[PDB]
Symmetry: C4
Subunit: 388 residues, 4 copies
């Protein structure tokens, strides 16, 4: 119809209710489920779907051996119906590649997949299910993008890309696309020192992205974008409640414009909702690995270097495997506010569960409630032993 | 289009004709069929579908071991095409949870799923495939609902919930929703002493629900709701023809305002059509277990404590397993009256058939005919031995 | 839109071209294909589909053992996309039963399924995917119908039913339905002595049905119906070219108003296009069993008791299994005439191939061409040994 | 809507970006994927799909033994969603046969399948999913067609057919169809000596086809068609860069009006984009077998007998199997020019990999970019050993 505009503010988050869960690994033990990783959720005006990077093989398939690897010629961005597992028969390929992002502008969808060898990758921007623009690697070192949905405002959909080192300074660019065409791009600015896999959402004509500083920060870098002026800023979440992984233990005061030290060259895709007192941070419970997952209300986390939790909700027990997590919202729902949502990737197999030769995941997703709901934990649920 | 109004009365039931059957267990012996239980049927203005609570695994899958349990993080309400089995590839998830209800108001559908641990469950009310309202447990003891379709009148769709004990008094509430929002709720009133899993239908601007008194009654409690005044009453079916299970033998006189004694703390979801002489009761043939199923015409059953059968129709032989049963009607069919329909859940596996480690079911469904049709019996049809 | 009217005459049949083939048995050797029998083809204004009576199990499934039986509680009329096999995941159930017919009136479709025990069966007439009318057995001996499509003219869709003996006189009725409601019914009249499984088609406001005289005739009975006057006549195909099976050898002169003797109490569903010189008869090559299949042009076959073939086309070699065959046409195609089409059921398994415990089939279908096309033979193609 | 007209010229090809890949063989190792060969890609105004000739069996199925054969009664043209594999459950049969072509005219699609024994084959032309015209073999020696999409201009869709010898002169005809009806046909003219499997595309009201001279040429014959005058010409690509296979080594000067000698009675379906300096040729890297695949920019290749490459892009390494390749374009995309695309069939199994008894393939497809993108190689990716 018309391009969607971010006219609403976030709803008050008082708790999180269950939104979707596909139990992919449980089901795929005896059904034709594709091996995946790097999942996310994204809405169209009339439907919300699950997204992920397939590995081009079923879990039970012999070609599942080796899927711990991130980039191959057999990966593709696929989408499928909410809470269903990604099967060979219900998955729709959006594009070919090993890194992606996707978002609906209100009229139609833009999907981006990057493929190629490490020193010669390229991004192909699809719009209305047709290829429209291509961008070649500028740093010739694994051109990569968000791994979760982008956000649009009046046709303009900003996307964050990084090309270059994962263990030192890299070259990050913010591209402003409209109908798949590049309107503008700018190099990253601000105090964020390294940017990867940004998790974004929008409200009141502003897009907020919580990313990953793989190089040095255990606190998470944040990029705020103005889709109209097509400009941005960057900093770190100030709060001493650290949210990357692995990470050092929580201090009493964080860092606003520098990476909090203690762990280098590693991290995990993550997210947060930075809205004054209505601020909630997601993070693995373990400071050592992708284990467990919790939501913590940290009022003014982005700007207050001593902010600590005031409420919380456990999503996955520390005795269960978690993984990537990112933001998305149904910008086409009724009501006066945007309901914050998120997904957590539940990784199974390698490297933590090496009795199997594969690596995959299932998805659990929640959205905010203004009620103060009881909590439950949501594990992947599969028994690795069944796969032996 | 416009909200549906219950303007018609029930058609004269002179017999029951076969409506749908999915032979799920038979087929799933060698195909990717999801393990389920607590099924029902529900119509949209242009299509009628099968519904159930998946267990998040296929029957042949190794994760089928243990599906005798009712509440887990791997269950979800799914719907699929009429008479097809619930497969991994054709099932649509309506919401995540282990207790549900769903109904179309004429414009769009409302689905409700409850999830969580026993002392901290919550209901999420979906409307137009989007989450709209959430209700937290009020008694912190397995918040639960109908397990069959709700009914709407001019946008207002009442739903019966129970929170609290299954073996003593509990807290039942009737919620009046419109477009997924709570218009009002009231505590249960009348003479029904315990309410669970209500089976409802509507005609002439009135909704009738036949429920389950798990605590003491072998006769079935009945809740009649006025969707306009948003008020209700409750009593028991007076007739000495008892319809819960397990149950004592049939007496010569029933009880109108108290549970008929003889069996405590147990029961089965069931239903009835209470329409003067056009009254028909469904029930298992066995008074000991979920075995067999029959329809009995008992004129004035609700109000006559000595009413006995005048006609009948066998649905499932006493030598075959039955289970839950509930009401639904296609409120969007042609004609001058609403054709009463019902489904019977045919449970296979545990606990009755313990040679297998799973528990599932298939569905058989019938609707009324004004003709006096010959009868047949409709078993699930699978051979457990094939699964050994 | 509007009800379809049979305003065109048949196109000149100079040969037959391949229309559809699903290779169901070949494919189902390693995929979830439903066991079926009694197939046919039928068109909607915008799509043509395959139809059949499922046995409620896959071919590879253990429940396939025993599918040689015709009537069970696990059968249903299903339809699926043209030339695809009937799989668990792509088959749509039209109704529950072990005998059926179906046809589109131009506005919507009417489907009829008969179910029940031999002495108490009933037909349920569905229209617009909703049950509308029910007809109870009148002779209490396997109420049964066409097993191929019916035909409509201005909303009126006649259907031929038989109730009673298969080895002596029975009670045949012609029902005239409009929107699933019975407008009228009449007992069979004319000289046909026994009627079963009629194969019908329409042109120039007249419906012609070629049926099966199971009792005594090896020539085929014919019922011509006037859908406007709602009246009919019946006789036998006069031609000495006999088309039932099993059957005696071809004589030099046939019988117009009596069954041609030689074989009693047996037969096979078959068809023909009776259009003056443009007359073509279908039949098995073997006079002993459902083996092979051929089309023979027999000018004036219906009215000329000495008519012999003038052209022919082999469809299935006598070294391959055939089975039922019937007529259908796409009444919604472009052009000035109706293109005659037909299907042949290719039965595999029992009783001819008893190394397997099942019985199923695949479908081959052709339509007429005004060209004189080269011919090929179209076997089912599966290797029974693969199933051992 | 309206018939599409070839009003645009080709976009400047500066490189090729990944468009689609189904990894069919990898996935089909453990899922119900149909055995195929002779694939292609073709767009409708609102969707682009993969096409191929199924062998009527799954890869893992026992009936896969023998699929090295090209013509059987079990083959059919099927289409399925872009980048998905051709599965039993997602494949749509367009028609029955062992040779085909298909194209959308802007209003609807025309599909053509040829079937029959070698000396009696026939083509059936389908339009709007209905059979419309039939053409009988004129040379009674394997009537055959393109094996890739045809192209339309204002309703007129030319198709190239060949009937007769594959090792000597044959009878090639160009048919001009409009709405499935034959408007005209002409015998091949010009200097091309043998024509097979033409790969076509259109721009500026002209259709260019790069075909295969199976008889003597290692250079490729070219047919240019005027869809308005309904006339054509034929010649060979002049360039010394030879593109058939097997083939002799590249000389320094090619042949414009005669087959370049060195290899007789063999070849492979291939293609090219002949657009002045914007000319690109596709070809296997190996001169001995269907191994590897590369794109080479050869300015003025069609008319310059000494033209050599100026740029190139590897598509498949010479250490991986390739096969057929052809052209297609999305004539319904936005923009001022038509983006050239192509697919490469990646054959697996027999005859090169004879450890398995089957022959199949997967598909890789690319489209042009005006950017100068980095390249990667795209193998089928399956491990034959897994199939042993
Ligand atoms: C039914 O459902 C309801 C609804 O869910 C249940 O009630 C919920 O209960 C939750 C658990 O009690 C509760 O969540 C906690 O909230 C605390 C905040 O509330 C408290 O403080 C404020 C401020 O003074 C008060 O207003 C309020 O009244 C409370 O007292 C959080 O502080 C909790 O989070 C911390 O603890 C958990 C352990 O449970 C950690 O996993 C988490 O990371 C937090 O602690 C770490 O981080 C802080 C900050 O840096 C450190 O100070 C601390 O030492 C920990 O650090 C270690 O661990 C981390 C992570 O491993 C590591 O990185 C670091 O290095 C250190 O090693 C928690 O979020 C909900 O708010 C509450 N909801 C409601 C509405 O009440 C109810 O119980 C259920 N009913 C039943 C019967 O079960
Ligand atoms: C072809 O098709 C047609 C159509 O279906 C077939 O005809 C149908 O035949 C049915 C079976 O005969 C028949 O169903 C029965 O109807 C009886 C009512 O009709 C009779 O009574 C009235 C009133 O005086 C008359 O008008 C009428 O003419 C009849 O005489 C019911 O009473 C029957 O139900 C009872 O019996 C069955 C056993 O078959 C029980 O399973 C059922 O629960 C009922 O009996 C129990 O309950 C009563 C009430 O409390 C007790 O009094 C009784 O002792 C039983 O109690 C024990 O069992 C229950 C359940 O296990 C347990 O809870 C309790 O504690 C006790 O242990 C039955 O419904 C259809 O009406 C009839 N339809 C038509 C249109 O005719 C025809 O046969 C078929 N043809 C062929 C050739 O097969
Ligand atoms: C490429 O493609 C084209 C197109 O298909 C191929 O050409 C086709 O070739 C067909 C085979 O030759 C041919 O079909 C035959 O046509 C005969 C009719 O044509 C002839 O007669 C008329 C009249 O005088 C002439 O106008 C005409 O020129 C011909 O001479 C039919 O008579 C044939 O059918 C009979 O034979 C077959 C055996 O092939 C039987 O299976 C069939 O049942 C018919 O014979 C039985 O029935 C008759 C009638 O009662 C009996 O008289 C006879 O004895 C047989 O009876 C026994 O068998 C039956 C069945 O088993 C049993 O019930 C009974 O009791 C007895 O035991 C046949 O139909 C096509 O017309 C022709 N098409 C065209 C356009 O030319 C071409 O060959 C192909 N090219 C190549 C290179 O292969
Ligand atoms: C990141 O990505 C970019 C983008 O892809 C990568 O850069 C690309 O690199 C490609 C490989 O170097 C390059 O492709 C080559 O281009 C050559 C043309 O360019 C050159 O010549 C012109 C003219 O003078 C100059 O303008 C230009 O600057 C270059 O110098 C082609 O000639 C190449 O093709 C030939 O070589 C390959 C071997 O690689 C053969 O497979 C191919 O068939 C061609 O050679 C055969 O054919 C010719 C013509 O007849 C014969 O003369 C020759 O002897 C060969 O013949 C034998 O082999 C064939 C086939 O087997 C057989 O039939 C015959 O009988 C003989 O046996 C090649 O296409 C891209 O243009 C370039 N793209 C860009 C934009 O730069 C970059 O490297 C990547 N980065 C990294 C870090 O990897
Ligand atoms: C393009 C790409 O390879 N992304 C990979 C990403 C990357 O290596 C990291 O961000 C350092 O740059 O890491 C991970 C990961 O599970 O940690 C998975 C992604 O597949
Ligand atoms: C929410 C829930 O657990 N419902 C369960 C219900 C419940 O235990 C009973 O109504 C007593 O309260 O019983 C049964 C049952 O087969 O008998 C199945 C349901 O899964
Ligand atoms: C309703 C029914 O059973 N129809 C059966 C029909 C019938 O027995 C015969 O027409 C004699 O009446 O025969 C056959 C058959 O393969 O020959 C199959 C049908 O399933
Ligand atoms: C109609 C037909 O059989 N086409 C076949 C084609 C043909 O034999 C050749 O063009 C010589 O005429 O060859 C090949 C091939 O892989 O080389 C495959 C096709 O199936
Ligand atoms: C998987 O691959 C490894 C490495 O190639 C090999 O050694 C191992 O045996 C394989 N595992 C399986 C189950 O094939
Ligand atoms: C199912 O689980 C039980 C309990 O854990 C175990 O003892 C049993 O062996 C399992 N059954 C199967 C078939 O695995
Ligand atoms: C099929 O059933 C028969 C009859 O019950 C039995 O004797 C036979 O062994 C079964 N065949 C198979 C393969 O189970
Ligand atoms: C395939 O067929 C050949 C030829 O009929 C036979 O000799 C071979 O054993 C078969 N291969 C398999 C795996 O069955
Ligand atoms: Ca980090
Ligand atoms: Ca009870
Ligand atoms: Ca399987
Ligand atoms: Ca007979
Ligand atoms: Ca050649």
């Amino acid at each position: 119809r018309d391009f969607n505009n971010l006219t609403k503010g976030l709803c008050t988050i008082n708790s999180w209710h269950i939104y979707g869960k596909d139990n992919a690994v449980r089901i795929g033990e005896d059904s034709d489920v594709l091996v995946t990783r790097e999942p996310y959720v994204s809405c169209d005006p009339d439907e919300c779907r699950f997204y992920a990077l397939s590995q081009g093989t079923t879990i039970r398939g012999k070609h599942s051996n080796g899927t711990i690897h991130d980039r191959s010629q057999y990966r593709a961005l696929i989408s499928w119906p909410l809470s269903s597992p990604p099967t060979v028969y219900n998955s729709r390929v959006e594009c070919i590649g090993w890194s992606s992002t996707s978002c609906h502008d209100g009229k139609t969808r833009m999907s981006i997949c990057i493929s190629g060898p490490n020193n010669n990758a390229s991004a192909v921007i699809w719009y209305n299910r047709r290829p429209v623009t291509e961008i070649n690697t500028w740093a010739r070192n694994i051109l990569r993008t968000q791994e979760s949905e982008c956000v649009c405002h009046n046709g303009v959909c900003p996307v964050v890309f990084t090309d270059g080192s994962a263990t030192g300074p890299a070259e990050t660019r913010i591209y402003y696309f409209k109908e798949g065409k590049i309107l503008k791009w700018e190099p990253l600015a601000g105090t964020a020192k390294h940017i990867e896999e940004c998790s974004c959402y929008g409200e009141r004509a502003e897009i907020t992205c919580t990313c990953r500083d793989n190089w040095q920060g255990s606190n998470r870098p944040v990029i705020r974008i103005d889709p109209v002026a097509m400009t941005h800023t960057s900093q770190y979440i100030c709060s001493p409640v650290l949210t990357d992984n692995p990470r050092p233990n929580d201090p009493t005061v964080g860092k606003c414009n520098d990476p909090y030290p203690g762990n280098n060259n590693n991290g995990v895709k993550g997210f947060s909702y930075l809205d004054g007192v209505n601020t909630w941070l997601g993070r693995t419970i373990s400071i050592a690995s992708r284990s467990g997952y919790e939501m913590l209300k940290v009022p003014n986390a982005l700007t207050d270097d001593k902010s600590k939790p005031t409420q919380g909700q456990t999503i996955v027990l520390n005795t269960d495997w978690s993984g990537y997590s990112g933001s998305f919202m149904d910008y086409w729902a009724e009501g006066e506010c945007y309901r914050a949502c998120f997904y957590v990737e539940l990784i199974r197999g390698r490297p933590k569960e090496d009795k199997v030769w594969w690596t995959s995941n299932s998805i659990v997703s929640m959205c905010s409630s203004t009620e103060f709901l009881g909590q439950w934990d949501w594990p992947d649920g599969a028994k690795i032993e069944y796969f032996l």
